């Protein structure tokens, strides 16, 4: 036990979803998992462990921001032995092209937080995911019948920007959503070892303000998860 | 109703305590606060609003991490009436002269993130809290006979520090604790217009190693609390 | 005709080949291109435009360093509607598993020149290539019967840098190869709306000098040509 | 002697004010000091010792600009036993609301200087105030019916700013006076472990233009000078 | 031999003229050198040493940006004993008294590469050109009845720049022509002990084209040469 | 007349020398100008304006630092139409065979300084003097029989270094000798249109730590000033 996490070596899979609400843990826990047990509870922020089709799979919240998930993903790694971690969030896009219940799978991601460069001697570190990882996810994605787009996430240290003005120059570069963590969890996967990827559902737009009808979204939802499990089973192959 | 707030306008008090776990939270609102209501559950972050001697107070948490706070922060100023934020918080200590326990109140608070020199054009914005808050928290300390140094903190984006040589240059500059929020509250602050006091609790020592558990962060400091509440009311005064 | 290509719109085939030594333009007409023909000449970087199993494929250096390489990038991209840029090169191990002659495929390329920071307001890019692109390549590999590692590439301004210090570091975030353009070229990709990839032969190992012949350096060469002539196929499908 | 003090130790109090101006320094010892002798003359930066109701004092100028105080600062910590450095100096107002001769007491200093940076690898080193002294000198600001602001203070490199815009910044983040001394000051005084405070007198207005003459500035800025004095008695009780 | 120069010592002149285009390189050696023989043609870049009035020069080129150029230069520099190197190349103007076909000569070059703030630990260097070369080509040009302007020179990283606001400071801080290697060059000679100088004609006038004959960039170019090699007779005196 | 020189237009000549020291500007005056007059005392910087040999010039101090020049002399150029400074005074040695009583001539100038990042976008601008000045001061001590060194200085922020470590790298990069204003003053002069020099006398070393007889080095310090005022007349013709 760590002082984030009160369990044992054992107690967690070797492979890790997280959503970043705790609340989501407990969603996908009981709606996808079976014989699932909740693991740890510190701070409110619950895990779950069970199966899916025979295979043992874990699912908890890493909270909001990369300095939060920074210390779970760390964590998991060096003290419950993960080997792989799939985030599930949602992301706000900025390209025309993208629409809302678009699956975005962030094989980079870009950001505005200091922490890589105090890894990499201040210099430009590409954080990406596991090249296996993506690839399983696509598959997945296909096999389900779903479009998912591949490419770039930013991840912002402010979710209120002082400036809106990066929002024009993300768009320039082509970057597919903006989120909270993924360039935190890449940079945690390189510095210790393990595996990661990042996989989101565009939940707003910089553009367009319009939703759609919760049915239809809590749908989406359920799509990304059902794709990082099957690209688990892929994996194992 | 805000993006991560389930409430309307009047359901928090004009000042609210704000420890980054939720589950204190909980604690300090059923062991300190009369009449206490549940005001916010979103992702899990419960919100309390009672009353304390009779003064409307309430109590939430914020998570770890600047980016994490930083969310909750502006939201309760820009649409909840806030006018005072009082976090309370843990910390580490890097100096040989303190112990776990020990009180500490921020004047000021270094850091490591990004987010202020986004703010302030890359120059050093200096983050400290509002010198009333800090005073009123000496006195009430005094009048409760707890001790209490006043300084700076650090304010940390990686929990896991890749560079411990770090921890030499704080020590050397005289920083009383690390922890993960404050320079980004007070960043908050300053941009939309609020005022703002950081105050720790040592629950461990980087040097030695020395620990408290979750379970007594989560339930065991009360000193922290009482100067707090009590720095509260002779702020109104 | 731009500053640096003597040609017009049609010269040059969606896809073009990139080897830094402009002498290589030359051999990889020759040697595996049908129907060659000269596109140009200008301060002698000679490029051709010809056939592989019937599919339009051009070939032309881009020089050592990301200044030369941003300059032709773009100017076939903007000018000549370049759509896919493939830089086929060399580039050093910092790793023990690499091996000299492995072939490398660039997910990512890190870096410590400033040309993203101008472009990204000071932020981190991720430069990345094309995912489809990425995976072309790798089944490409595998279908000749060549294992490819898929990962980070490092992209330095200085050959001969100051300090070797950074080698370590690069080792301990699984840099695969060190090389002087991918972040450039990916750079560009993203700026004016292309794709692109490298790929890099290991022709030497940092710290450690090996031995290899002209004929099995020969081979590789080939082999890195091949795979890259093949992806392309692989995309059109 | 030191190489910019000629003087030996005991000839200075274990408290010295300091103005950026020799020729204030000289004022202040004529106007408010009894038996003030002159203890240096070295690049005629004048240093005089004398008493206040009976407690010994020492006031000397400091020059303009960061570099400059940094010198003799440290000199006098280092060599001559001074434990407390208290600036006297003058500033311009950046907010509407402030008017000349108007008292500010600065708590913390921003600063476009990198000298703090240099100090602390890098990162934000909030350079504040001793918050003893900063009371001592509300405390006695009061006792003299005298108003003062308590804030921060913006320390700056270049007089003649090559850039109006971020006066703009400065007055949204509430800066109380623009000066160029007090974060150099502060981060001497945790270098080499002193005590430092700066109080200073609206000498100009940067928005309306209004200003002071050369000679008010001089011998007319007394306010400040009986808050210092007065602050110094409070913190011996 | 050296990773790019395929010679020993000896065969290179103590002084080494370096046109960024190769086959600039040809053209020299035949039309002012007497004698000439090859000694390099790595890569295409063709090396050649003969005599001028009797003075053994050599001629190389550098390739397109400073990534390049410190290669080459770093190689003659440390294995081959150059002790003086002459670039001979061309820029672009900002000013408006600076016009088409004029010569240059770069006491000193500004840039927006990171390669000298690698060597110098983040702080400014200087990047200055020998003073007696800077004074031979000086004198040498008003021998020949050609009129040059002494100043600084901006080496850009991006000759596609994506903002042209930089444009206007360059001209606000009188930069007298826009090119790509000579802060490189002179970054290399202060690192390794050697000395160097970059001499430009202005081939374009940003923002404002004008016209020019084959005929007479042919005299402009021949000038430049010759003005360079008698700048060395006059350093040998 | 300003806030710092309670002068007007016509008091100053059109060349100014300076000295960091106002007590030298006193001693120059007195020693090498005929009628000459006190102009300025504001803070004690005294100013003096007089003539040499029938030439009008003037001598005032500029105190230490490049923010406490940096106001003068910005002042004298757009208040008081000086064309030319000359910054005399002196300097470390780092250079091992960089004697004491060497003089040094500052065609360039390093710092740690961030002013010019701020005035150049954040890039490198070369600090550099006019090079028909630093000719001028060369030819004038030949004629004195003197040697002079042409070359880097470095800008300092800190007299008292932190970390000592910046001069090994100023030695390893060829650094003449260390100050604190040289490139500053070159910063206002290319911001405002004017021209500038630095002319320094090495005052102590590095390496070994001796002195010599006052005699000596005054007698060199009035030669570096009669370069200065000899090489006016030179620039005159
Ligand atoms: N438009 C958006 N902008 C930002 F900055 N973060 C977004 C957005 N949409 C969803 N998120 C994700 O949800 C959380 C913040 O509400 C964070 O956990 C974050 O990853
Ligand atoms: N040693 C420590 N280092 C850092 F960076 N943060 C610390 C430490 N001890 C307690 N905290 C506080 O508690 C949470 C992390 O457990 C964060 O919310 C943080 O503010
Ligand atoms: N070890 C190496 N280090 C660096 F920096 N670049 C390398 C290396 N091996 C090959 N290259 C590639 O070949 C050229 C430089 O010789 C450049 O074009 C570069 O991409
Ligand atoms: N508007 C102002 N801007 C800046 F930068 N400094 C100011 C200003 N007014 C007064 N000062 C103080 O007085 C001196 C400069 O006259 C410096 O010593 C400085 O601290
Ligand atoms: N206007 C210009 N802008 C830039 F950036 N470089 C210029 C320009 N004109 C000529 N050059 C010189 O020629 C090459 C680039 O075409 C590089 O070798 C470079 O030194
Ligand atoms: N070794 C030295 N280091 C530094 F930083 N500055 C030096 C040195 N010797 C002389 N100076 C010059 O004299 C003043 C500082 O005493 C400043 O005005 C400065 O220019």
Do not use: W
Not at 206 to 225: L, S, V
């Amino acid at each position: 036990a760590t002082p984030h996490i009160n369990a044992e070596m054992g107690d967690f899979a070797d492979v890790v979803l997280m959503p970043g609400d705790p609340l989501r843990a407990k969603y996908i826990a009981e709606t996808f998992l079976e014989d699932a047990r909740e693991v740890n509870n510190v701070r409110g922020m619950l895990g779950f462990t069970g199966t899916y089709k025979g295979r043992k799979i874990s699912v908890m919240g890493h909270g909001m921001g990369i300095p939060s998930c920074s210390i779970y993903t760390k964590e998991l790694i060096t003290d419950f032995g993960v080997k792989k971690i799939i985030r599930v969030g949602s992301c706000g896009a900025v390209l025309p092209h993208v629409k809302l219940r678009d699956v975005v799978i962030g094989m980079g991601a870009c950001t505005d937080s200091k922490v890589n460069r105090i890894r990499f001697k201040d210099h430009d570190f590409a954080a990406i995911a596991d090249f296996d990882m993506v690839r399983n996810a696509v598959d997945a994605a296909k096999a389900l019948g779903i479009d998912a787009r591949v490419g770039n996430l930013f991840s912002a240290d402010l979710f209120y920007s002082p400036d809106g003005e990066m929002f024009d120059v993300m768009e320039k570069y082509g970057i597919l959503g903006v989120e909270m963590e993924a360039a935190g969890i890449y940079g945690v996967a390189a510095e210790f070892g393990a595996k990661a990827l990042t996989i989101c559902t565009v939940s707003d737009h910089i553009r367009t303000h319009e939703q759609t009808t919760a049915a239809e979204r809590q749908t989406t939802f359920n799509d990304m998860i059902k794709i990082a499990l099957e690209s688990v089973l892929l994996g194992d192959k």
